[PDB]
Amino acid sequence: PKPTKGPRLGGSSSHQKAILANLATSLFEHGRITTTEPKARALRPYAEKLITHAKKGALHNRREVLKKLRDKDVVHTLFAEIGPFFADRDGGYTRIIKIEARKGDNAPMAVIELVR
C-alpha cells in the first residue's frame, strides 16, 4: 500500500517487510495481537490487503499472499476461514484499540485484531 513516510520500522525497509510479515502472521494466527501503536497502524492496511487476497481465494491469490508470508499453516488458515468469514464484508477487516503505553520506554501500545 501507501509507502511509509519517514524512517521505516525497525530501521531498514527490509526489516520493515519482515516486521509486517511477522505481525500479519501473528494476527492471522491469534486473531488479536498487541504491538506498538505505529506498528499496528502500519500493519492494518498490509493485513487487510492480505485478507483481500484471501477473499478472492484463487490459487494466484494464494501465491500472492505466500509471496509475502512464509507460514503455510497461517496462509491455509487465512484462505480457509479468515477470507471466507470476511467474504461478505467490504474492507475494514481489522480494528486498532489503543491501550496503555508500556513501561521502560513509554512506547504507545495498541491491540490490533480481526473484527469478529
Binding site: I97, K98, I99, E100, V111
Partner: protein, 54 residues
Amino acid sequence: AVPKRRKSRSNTRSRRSQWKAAKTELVGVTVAGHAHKVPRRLLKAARLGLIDFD
C-alpha cells in the same frame, strides 16, 4: 562553546520552570458497575476491559 558565566538564579529558574509534564486529559468511565478515571484515548480499551486499572 562553554558557558561564559554561570546563570543567575532568575535566569536558571525562568528556563527550568518550563520543563514540566504534559497534563493528560482524563474522563470518567463506568465498567463492571464501578467508576474510574482514564485518559480519553484509552476509553475504548477501558470499556473493552483491556485496561488494568490498578
